[PDB]
Amino acid sequence: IPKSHPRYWSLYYREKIIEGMEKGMTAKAGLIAHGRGEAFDYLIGERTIEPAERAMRAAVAKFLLAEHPVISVNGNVAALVPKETIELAKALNAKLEINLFYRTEERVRTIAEELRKYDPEIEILGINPTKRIPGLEHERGKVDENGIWKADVVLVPLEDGDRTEALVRMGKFVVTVDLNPLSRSARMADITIVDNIVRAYPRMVELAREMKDYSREELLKIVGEYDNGKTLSDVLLHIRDRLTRLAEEGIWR
Amino acid sequence: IPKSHPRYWSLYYREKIIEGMEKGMTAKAGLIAHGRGEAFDYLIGERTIEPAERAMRAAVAKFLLAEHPVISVNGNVAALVPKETIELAKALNAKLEINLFYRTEERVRTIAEELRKYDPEIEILGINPTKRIPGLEHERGKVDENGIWKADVVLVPLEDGDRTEALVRMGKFVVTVDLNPLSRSARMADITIVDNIVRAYPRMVELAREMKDYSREELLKIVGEYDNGKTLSDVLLHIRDRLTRLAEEGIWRRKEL
Ligand SMILES: Nc1ncnc2c1ncn2[C@@H]1O[C@H](COP(=O)(O)OP(=O)(O)OP(=O)(O)O)[C@@H](O)[C@H]1O
Ligand SMILES: Nc1ncnc2c1ncn2[C@@H]1O[C@H](COP(=O)(O)OP(=O)(O)OP(=O)(O)O)[C@@H](O)[C@H]1O
Ligand SMILES: [Mg+2]
């Protein structure tokens, strides 16, 4: 399709998610999840909205003040932002852990190989996790002692509500990127970024540098003031107004 | 999936659509599409709202008054409501036609076999459609000559706008099941049922049996007063008020909506 196609990027990223499945990284359930992401993205406007920028500033602040920052990676992340998830882990000095709900050997390997394609030297935790998140079935709650297990601040993007929830109960401060503000994961996380992860990861990286040197007292003012409930509400309000406008345009009969 | 799970029904149908692709009936793109429907189902509340019940009564009435109704069947319909689609067709005296966006012989065959598991002798059209619906991709515009090609009323659920619109330009009265009330398909169709096909179909089969005796008079009064445009806006209003309410009440850490 021509570069001017209004569906240009979502189409571009869709092939990417399919290539993901082809590479054995992205699970079938992943394609379904991607579609949900697409629809929601169409609704918010395929751009980072103010409530998302707001939550991202707060999440970055929180990661810089963190003690053991950990960025989680699953099959979709690997298909969409392999390079950006690494850059983000460095800009935040957080470690990288592959963490799958539907964990298999090939999938962990392929995702591992995919990340390396961009940095053959990054430490990738999660190849053989020993620990478990309490409240989850064994095979779905694995976590590596050096990563999530010891983490205080965690970023689990595109995550399932059971895991997000078990993580909060476990005492971890949870940050996620999720285009569905109505999902359990989005509603349970401590900081929810409602934005397409292809836009949020590079943005959080930019915000990383822009905040690189901030008075710890400032980084603390930022997070201390952030209101995830207010954020969710504004996102729901954003979507509604969008629905009012969208319904007023396009082909009809 | 334990039935006690808060998201049992959501997960159940995700498994079904996945087992559909594996059984060769459902395409990969169909998995994404199922996901798109889910996004809209969330906005609606994952239930049958009034404006859906309304559109469905009209559709059934229209199908009962038709003389050459046809019900389409794609990979998603085949994996999610194989039995209800057959029930509905027979409760509406409509013919069944297999229609896919990504057509192949293995896919047509498997969708064919799945329907049989519910009726070993059910008639199935679209096996090798030969009529080219003009103004479309040859690859995705061929219909069955004894099916859609001569139908007066057609039901094409989870349809792409290009097909839904082309059929309208074909002079076919079109009914559809589409969770996105803003979709081109939802806008070009004569009667749009904004509801999940796993809820709408069995609900429509109910109506086709409870309406089988409605007088021509009553049925014509229904199809006659129906207003797709008003029904779509009614759907958007439901959603916008739900969003307003949730926003005001707040949803962070909220378990139940
Ligand atoms: N490309 C993407 N960018 C951002 N977010 C995404 C993307 N793809 C999927 N998501 C989000 O991740 C979720 C997909 O995972 P999952 O299937 O667990 O969702 P869900 O089950 O509906 O939510 P929950 O598990 O909280 O009930 C979706 O809710 C969607 O909002
Ligand atoms: N399980 C389901 N139940 C009800 N409706 C569904 C389901 N899955 C998908 N749909 C609807 O069918 C459509 C699938 O087709 P597709 O997504 O290709 O069309 P679209 O490009 O999103 O919209 P359009 O092509 O009409 O502009 C979706 O718009 C969705 O609203
Ligand atoms: Mg889930």
Rounded Cα distance between A85 and A205, Å, is: 9
* Method for this entry: X-ray
* Structural domains in chain A plus CATH codes: 1-253 (3.40.50.12640)
Ligand nearest to the CA of A32: 1
Which of A42, A233, A242, A252 to probe the B interface (max B CBs under 10 A)?
A233
**CA B126 – ligand 1 centroid, Å:** 35
Of B176, B185, B203, B235, best ligand 2 pocket probe by most atoms within 8 Å of the beta carbon: B185
**A37 CB near ligand 1 (under 6 Å):** yes
Q: What are phi and psi of A241, to 5 degrees?
A: -60, -35
CB B229 within 8 A of CB B58: no
- CA geometry: angle at A107 spanning A106 and A110, to 5°? 80
Rounded Cα distance between A20 and A77, Å, is: 10
Q: Do A39 and B7 touch (CB under 8 A)?
A: no
Rounded Cα distance between B200 and B158, Å, is: 12
**B196 CB near ligand 2 (under 6 Å):** yes
Report how many Cβ contacts below 8 Å link chain A to chain B: 117
Residue A116, CA distances (Å) to A83, B148, B249 in order: 9, 52, 45
Cβ density class B214-248: b for 16+ within 10 Å, e for less:
beeeebeebbeebebeebbebbbebbbebbeebbe
Of ligand 1's atoms, which has the minimum distance to the CA of residue A17? Answer: 1
- On whether any CB of chain A is under 8 Å from the CB of B66, the answer is no
- Collapsed DSSP state (helix, strand, coil) of residue B100: coil
Binding-site residues of A for ATP, please?
14, 36, 178-180, 184-185, 196-197
Closest chain B CA to residue A182: B42
Q: Do B187 and A37 touch (CB under 8 A)?
A: no
Ligand nearest to the CA of B1: 3
Which residues of chain B lie closer than 8 angstroms to A35, CB-CB? 31-36, 38-39
Chain center to CA of B63: 14
Resolution of the experimentally solved model in angstroms: 2.4
Q: Do A243 and B240 touch (CB under 8 A)?
A: yes
Chain A residues 74-113 with CB within 8 Å of chain B: none
Q: Looking at the partner chain, which of A29, A188, A233 has a beta carbon nearest the beta carbon of B247?
A: A233
- CA geometry: angle at B47 spanning A31 and A34, to 5°? 10
Give the residues across from A97 on adjacent strands: A72, A125
Q: Do A253 and B188 touch (CB under 8 A)?
A: yes
Helix intervals (H) in chain A: 8-22, 28-44, 50-64, 75-80, 82-91, 105-116, 138-141, 161-169, 184-188, 197-211, 216-225, 228-246
Chain center to CA of A69: 14
| Crossing angle between the packed helical segments B28-44 and B228-249, to the nearest 10 degrees | 70
Rg of chain B on CA atoms, in Å: 18
Rounded Cα distance between B136 and B144, Å, is: 15
Residues by chain with Cβ below 5 Å of ion ligand 3: A 160
Strand order across the A191-193 sheet: A124-125, A95-98, A70-73, A153-155, A173-177, A191-193
Rounded Cα distance between B143 and B148, Å, is: 6
- Collapsed DSSP state (helix, strand, coil) of residue A174: strand
Cβ density class A164-193: b for 16+ within 10 Å, e for less:
bbbbbebebbbbbbbbbbbbbbbbbbbbbb
CB-based burial label for A68 (10 Å; 0-12, 13-18, 19+): middle
Q: Looking at the partner chain, which of B33, B188, B243 has a beta carbon nearest the beta carbon of A35?
A: B33
Q: What are phi and psi of A114, to 5 degrees?
A: -65, -40
Cβ density class A86-112: b for 16+ within 10 Å, e for less:
bbbbebbebbbbbbbbebeeebbebbb
**CA B216 – ligand 1 centroid, Å:** 47
**B201 CB near ligand 2 (under 6 Å):** no
Which residue in A135, A139, A134 sits closest to A107, CA to CA? A139
Which residue in B80, B66, B90, B1 sits closest to B33, CA to CA? B80
**CA B154 – ligand 3 centroid, Å:** 35
Maximum Cα interatomic distance, chain A, rounded to a whole number of Å: 60
Rounded Cα distance between B100 and B110, Å, is: 12
Rounded Cα distance between B184 and B170, Å, is: 16
Which of A11, A160, A235, A240 to probe the B interface (max B CBs under 10 A)?
A240
Rounded Cα distance between B16 and A222, Å, is: 45
Rounded Cα distance between B205 and B214, Å, is: 15
Which residues of chain A lie closer than 8 angstroms to B246, CB-CB? 182, 233, 236
Binding-site residues of B for ATP, please?
14, 36, 178-180, 184-185, 196-197
End-to-end CA distance of chain B: 22
Chain B residues 175-214 with CB within 8 Å of chain A: 180, 182, 184, 187-188
Rounded Cα distance between B151 and B147, Å, is: 6
